Design a binder for this molecule. Sequence first.
Ligand SMILES: CC(C)[C@@H](C)/C=C/[C@@H](C)[C@H]1CC[C@H]2C3=CC=C4C[C@@H](O)CC[C@]4(C)[C@H]3CC[C@]12C
Ligand SMILES: CC(C)[C@@H](C)/C=C/[C@@H](C)[C@H]1CC[C@H]2C3=CC=C4C[C@@H](O)CC[C@]4(C)[C@H]3CC[C@]12C
Lengths: 266, 275
Amino acid sequence: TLNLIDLKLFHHYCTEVWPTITSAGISGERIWSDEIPQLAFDYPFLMHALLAFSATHLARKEPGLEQYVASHRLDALRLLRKAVLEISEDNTDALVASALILIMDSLANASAWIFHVKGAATILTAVWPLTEKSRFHNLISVDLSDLVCFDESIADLYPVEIDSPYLITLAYLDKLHREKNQSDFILRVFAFPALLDKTFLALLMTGDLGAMRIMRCYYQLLRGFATEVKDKVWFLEGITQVLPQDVDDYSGGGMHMMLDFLGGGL
Amino acid sequence: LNLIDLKLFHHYCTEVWPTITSAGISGERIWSDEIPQLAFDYPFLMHALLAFSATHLARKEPGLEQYVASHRLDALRLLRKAVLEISEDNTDALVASALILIMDSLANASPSAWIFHVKGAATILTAVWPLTEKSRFHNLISVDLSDLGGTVSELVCFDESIADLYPVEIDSPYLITLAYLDKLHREKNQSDFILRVFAFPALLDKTFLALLMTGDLGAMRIMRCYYQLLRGFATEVKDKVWFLEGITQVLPQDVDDYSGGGMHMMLDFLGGGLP
Ligand SMILES: CC(C)[C@@H](C)/C=C/[C@@H](C)[C@H]1CC[C@H]2C3=CC=C4C[C@@H](O)CC[C@]4(C)[C@H]3CC[C@]12C
Ligand SMILES: CC(C)[C@@H](C)/C=C/[C@@H](C)[C@H]1CC[C@H]2C3=CC=C4C[C@@H](O)CC[C@]4(C)[C@H]3CC[C@]12C
């Protein structure tokens, strides 16, 4: 029929939106610049996810368009969770990029945002780990090949001994704070709860005290970081209205906040 | 969700505009961003844009030449209509679609229908001329704003002479075209020369062009000089500029070897006896 709307939205992505991604701290410029756009021609679910994020960013200076954010994301999730079942090595990078786009898109609106966030972040978990052939490998995770939270110290947790179910997560979280300033920190701290190891995660959803103390320290880092770049990164603006400072101020309290971002399932 | 037009349009903003800039055309933000943003408001330009880009992506992928045709004719049909409501809002969109359609017709030349298409496309330039200097596109013309001076300048054609047309009078119906043709030779190497040289027969003053359509031999010798200018520049960039490849196997060297002789070649390329 000829569609100038998606044409406008896609042109907007390769002109105005991808630099939006790179100046928030993400690296791999040609990832966002050209590799993701051509990936979208082979995988519809990525194209819809690109298009929706694009409309979301443009709808800041044009009305209309908010019915185009809704169409493209529903279509993106529909095709995602079946693409999510035949996960392949030809379509994992397309699946990670869609999840990252969907995360930034959901983050830019402020119960539904949580529901898309959680769904989007389930794609990261189902693809984890990535071969290091993936364009996306060092942008979402941290180097774990080697050997504190002022408000709620997790010091009565070290020493960590080798068979602790906290070892991996404490290491991960420790490495995550010291690249607080290296490239791709946005993606790594967003991707963290989605890449927890299976045993820690099982411990968490039972309410293990130690696992929750560790996650609340993570939360200070994530909210701290968001508090500090909200000014700069358009798709994080006003996320700290959504994320309360006392996570016990969520409405079931901190434990239902934990459950609503980690629970559910098919 | 139509990913062919999305692939075609991404192909324009990444691979094809660099190819316009690189042939000698100026105003890189006109082609890289200003023309795409115009395409969203005027369907006829989008079609011309995607047709030209399919044309270009058809050099390395099969298929696609079903989509060159589709978009071209939908461009031509919408333009037909848009060129009647010619406005300040849509002059630049008209101009860019013509120039796109001209490069596209010239790339598919490699009446045998490109002529008809160039002719039709070039009608849009005529219908829009002259341009306010508000137009992004005041780069299809020379400036005839200066003058000459103790008398200064006389154009000289080599294979045939327009030497006996001198010195030209003020009331001469050759003055405007001869000055335009001399300045055109003088910016043979400045930017946007290919657009200027292509636009030239579309921007002739109506008096000179009625003289042409009646067979004035003076007007015809001048245009024979322009042809040497255009065929000479074309045969010498045709292997660097992709949409001009093979153009010399379609524009003969001796214009008397066209189908009905040079007289017919002239008139199959123009459009309508001026009042
Ligand atoms: C926004 C994207 C990056 C997604 C992935 C992150 C959401 C954050 C806000 C979610 C992910 C895990 C959630 C989380 C896990 C565990 C608990 C322990 C509980 O005792 C208090 C709530 C708490 C601490 C919650 C708070 C909200 C968290 C930290
Ligand atoms: C390809 C686009 C740019 C269109 C506009 C240009 C077509 C060219 C090839 C056409 C335009 C005017 C034509 C033209 C006009 C007048 C004459 C005089 C005649 O005694 C010989 C043929 C000749 C010289 C022809 C040759 C072909 C010309 C030069």
